[PDB]
Design a protein around this nucleic acid. Structure first.
Ligand SMILES: [K+]
Ligand SMILES: [K+]
Ligand SMILES: [K+]
Ligand SMILES: [K+]
Ligand SMILES: [K+]
Ligand SMILES: [K+]
Ligand SMILES: [Mg+2]
Ligand SMILES: [Mg+2]
Ligand SMILES: [Mg+2]
Ligand SMILES: [Mg+2]
Ligand SMILES: [Mg+2]
Ligand SMILES: [Mg+2]
Ligand SMILES: [Mg+2]
Ligand SMILES: [Mg+2]
Ligand SMILES: [Mg+2]
Ligand SMILES: [Mg+2]
Ligand SMILES: [Mg+2]
Ligand SMILES: [Mg+2]
Ligand SMILES: [Mg+2]
Ligand SMILES: [Mg+2]
Ligand SMILES: [Mg+2]
Ligand SMILES: [Mg+2]
Ligand SMILES: [Mg+2]
Ligand SMILES: [Mg+2]
Ligand SMILES: [Mg+2]
Ligand SMILES: [Mg+2]
Ligand SMILES: [Mg+2]
Ligand SMILES: [Mg+2]
Ligand SMILES: [Mg+2]
Lengths: 101, 91, 60, 59
RNA sequence: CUUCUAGUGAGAAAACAACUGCCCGUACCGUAAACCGACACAGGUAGUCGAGGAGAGUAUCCUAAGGUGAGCGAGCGAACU
RNA sequence: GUAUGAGUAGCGAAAGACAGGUGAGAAUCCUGUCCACCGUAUGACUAAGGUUUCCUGGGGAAGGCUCGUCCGCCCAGGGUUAGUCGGGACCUAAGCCGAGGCCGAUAGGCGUAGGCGAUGGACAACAGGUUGAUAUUCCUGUACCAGUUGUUUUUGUUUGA
RNA sequence: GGAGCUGUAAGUAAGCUAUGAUCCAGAGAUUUCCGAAUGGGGGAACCCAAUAUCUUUUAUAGGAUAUUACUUUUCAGUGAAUACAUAGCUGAUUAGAGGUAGACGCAGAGAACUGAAACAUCUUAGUACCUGCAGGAAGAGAAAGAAAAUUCGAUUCCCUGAGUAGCGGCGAGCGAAACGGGAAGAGCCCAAACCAACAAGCUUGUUGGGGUUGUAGGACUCCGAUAUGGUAGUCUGUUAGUAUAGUUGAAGGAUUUGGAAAAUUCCGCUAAAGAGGGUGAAAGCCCCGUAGACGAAAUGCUGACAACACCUAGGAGGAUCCUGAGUACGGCGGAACACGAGAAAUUCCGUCGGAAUCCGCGGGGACCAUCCCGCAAGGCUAAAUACUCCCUAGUGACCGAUAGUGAACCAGUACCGUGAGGGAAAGGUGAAAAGCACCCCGGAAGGGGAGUGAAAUAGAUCCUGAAACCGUGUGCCUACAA
């Protein structure tokens, strides 16, 4: 997948449009991704998860990975991805510039 | 079969503990097994001199979870009674 | 089975057609006789037919 | 693992198999009790027995 | 199972001590609310034990051991069934 | 799918009453006392059949022809210990299969030897206790059948037990 | 292949993973027990054994592995009546079993309802059913032919002939073939005469050589080539491709609405890619992808190319010999041929009888003569043709949950039945569980607030939510009327 854990990322669609953030986890079998600060839903929680009030948590729901646009780590302008065989090894590469990742 | 795959596990129950306090221990066993093999198995697994062995084979017990119903697996439970002048197996 | 060892003549079927050509099914059996034949150097009693006995050509 | 297992010799392979088998016996006991935490050691041991027997059979 | 010999045969008999003895069933219902009858159905369901008084008697009435109190009730006490 | 009949027939032979208790709630559950019913059974064994309905602890969504705190219902756990009981490692009847074989459009039918097959024959245990649930099975005593090893005492060594 | 992975299936635990996981593809190993089940039995998924080695136990008992069914083929050893021997027995070998694909095709056996407005011949129909043999196709197949042309040259299948010619209680109905046009294309072996070798007992069984036919052919007698082409063969190899994993694969950002933009407006970009699908709504430019370009270690498959292997000769004579015997044919009885005994040729089955062979034999729709065509009674043979349990890629003026498979949901299930067997119903929250923390009534369920959410009259009976039906309230009317 063109998205991978440890990647600063821009969002394309949603109420959290134009926000940035990194990848906390990725679900390829759903083609979804989780992003800190984005889609922070308010979950009425029970205390069976070591939360001795039950309470109301705020946690990041997944996001569909097609609503996402990666960032150049050297430009800030968000881009699309190509795959290139550099040094024999296959890596992601920016469009709009040849920067890796 | 092989002597360690003969025995599978012990049976921790109130009746079984009451038997442990009378020096005879319960064990789940390969359903294809034999009383002499249980004897050999314990004698080789604990260096304890066995005196007697009883066996039961338990029916499959009906169960269900929602729409879906079925059977608990068959079991064979041996009861291995030891001698005096022998060790007590530690579990 | 009930078959000539040599020619293979066996039971078949046929029709009895009456004078009004009412048709009914019949068995049509060949003329087989049990005969001590020298099969492969051994004498053996075997079904066999007159059409094979006529020729000589097979011994008793 | 398979590397050192293929490096071993036959009687050593069989001794190791027997010892894994005893370990599995004891783990079945500890699992019948509440005396075990690392349950995956069970599948690891069974996996390793399989590796060893496969290597013997393929020799 | 007993006997007979044919055969086979260098080991057999008793006393004592110790040891071994596999597989399936073993719960519970069972003149029934668990079996067969679509039902917790006034039906049917092999055999054994089956006490006492009176009595020929396992008949009959009331009881013993033991087991039951019936899986909708209350009142009113009409016609009619 | 929902009406109609209609909140009607029916609620499936028979005796229960009371006090207390549990409980949100009691004709219906529990304890107890009287009362009634069965008693060649409405009792105690047990084959088949059923196949978990058994025991414990919770429950009252549904089921139970009412209710229900209860159940053969639901949920989580447990429970069936045999050298001697019954059956097989023993025997066979009726009947079945059937090497080869015979007969036969095919397919197959019959049937010998030999096997299978109890409802029968043969075959070494029984007194008590014990669990919440198992009992000639577990426990304590006292045995019995078949067999093994060893010791002791005997007698048979090839006209040979 | 390159980072999340431990299925459905949440959730908890424990853990694995660039020391390259999960995942994907090829090959190999393990592959319990039943089942043809095959050591013997048996009520399938159970039981009991024999022999050899090894193991446990002081030793028995116990355990593991291997072998042990029947029948066929060959071989060997023993060996009865019964002497020779054979049968039989035993041991080694060899190849069969059984189910699939509710489909296709050869053969055996073979219906009836029905139609004929009844019905018996006839039809349905050589259908259904059953059974056997199978193969990827089968079957048929290289003329004892079709014709009338002196001519076409192996079978099969489509069109056509033609609903013709005929058959038929001359009724109902049944119904060709050839010519012609096309698809596909291929022809080969053997017995026999004779020759060489072996053997018993001049013939006569075996091996090899020879030779396969109709303008007759071959053997046999003479003349020369040693040739020349083909193959319907081989895990002989190589080579190339292809199937089974895959990789890459261009182009957009902002305003309005709105919970969300893919919609609207703005200017753009791209196209060997505007196929399709998904993405918070309708996206050529967000994603999967598409066009296009690359790619297989390993196992298969296909086609060529070399080696091996197998076939492959020419001209005169016919002195003589051979050219498929209980066969063709005939009688009787029956079938199939479009053809129902009819004038009934042709083919086949049963039975009985019963020819000649080159101046010979069969056919040309009774049959005779003439003419023409062909040479049976021995075998094989690809292709075009039929069908799909299945695999891959797909398509639809096909269905869209009473439809479409019986089955979109754990369906041949639950359930019914002794059994064969029959045989259902049941889909949709939301973009995302964010699925209602907390408070109140209540025993709980279920409500009411709060809160998430765009929306809760979207809250598990979940999108929409008709009608019947059950209610609540309300404007008008209604207790001398049929
Ligand atoms: K009495
Ligand atoms: K009996
Ligand atoms: K009639
Ligand atoms: K063929
Ligand atoms: K699109
Ligand atoms: K004819
Ligand atoms: Mg037992
Ligand atoms: Mg009992
Ligand atoms: Mg009742
Ligand atoms: Mg009424
Ligand atoms: Mg009642
Ligand atoms: Mg009486
Ligand atoms: Mg109970
Ligand atoms: Mg009720
Ligand atoms: Mg209870
Ligand atoms: Mg028979
Ligand atoms: Mg007999
Ligand atoms: Mg067997
Ligand atoms: Mg008719
Ligand atoms: Mg035609
Ligand atoms: Mg692209
Ligand atoms: Mg859409
Ligand atoms: Mg646009
Ligand atoms: Mg003729
Ligand atoms: Mg004839
Ligand atoms: Mg349907
Ligand atoms: Mg609908
Ligand atoms: Mg009036
Ligand atoms: Mg009025």
């Amino acid at each position: 997948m063109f998205v991978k854990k440890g990647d600063k990322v821009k969002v394309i669609t949603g109420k959290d449009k134009n926000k940035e953030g990194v990848v906390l986890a990725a679900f390829p079998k759903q083609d979804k991704v989780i992003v800190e600060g984005v889609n922070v839903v308010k979950k009425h929680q029970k205390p069976n998860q070591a939360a001795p009030q039950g309470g109301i948590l705020e946690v990041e729901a997944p996001i569909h990975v097609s609503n996402v646009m990666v960032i150049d780590p050297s430009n800030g302008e968000a881009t699309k991805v190509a795959f290139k065989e550099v040094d024999g090894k296959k890596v992601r590469v920016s469009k709009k510039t040849g920067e890796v990742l | 079969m092989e002597l360690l795959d003969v025995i599978k596990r012990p049976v921790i129950t109130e009746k079984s503990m009451l038997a442990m306090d009378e020096k005879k221990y319960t064990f789940e066993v390969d359903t294809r097994a034999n009383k002499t093999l249980v004897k050999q198995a314990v004698e080789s697994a604990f260096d304890v001199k066995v005196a007697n062995v009883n066996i039961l084979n338990v029916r499959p017990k009906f169960k269900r979870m929602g729409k879906y119903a079925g059977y608990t697996k068959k079991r064979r439970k041996a009861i291995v009674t030891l001698t005096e002048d022998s060790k007590e197996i530690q579990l | 089975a009930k078959v000539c060892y040599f020619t293979g003549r066996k039971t078949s079927s046929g029709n009895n057609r009456s004078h009004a050509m009412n048709s009914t099914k019949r068995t049509v059996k060949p003329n087989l006789q049990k005969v001590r034949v020298l099969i492969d150097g051994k004498p053996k009693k075997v079904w066999v037919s007159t059409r094979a006995l006529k020729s000589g050509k097979i011994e008793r | 693992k398979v590397k050192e297992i293929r490096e071993l010799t036959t009687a050593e392979m069989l001794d190791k198999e027997k010892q894994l088998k005893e370990e599995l016996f004891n783990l079945r006991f500890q699992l019948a009790t509440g005396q075990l935490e690392n349950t995956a050691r069970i599948k690891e041991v069974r996996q390793s027995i399989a590796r060893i027997k496969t290597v013997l059979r393929e020799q």
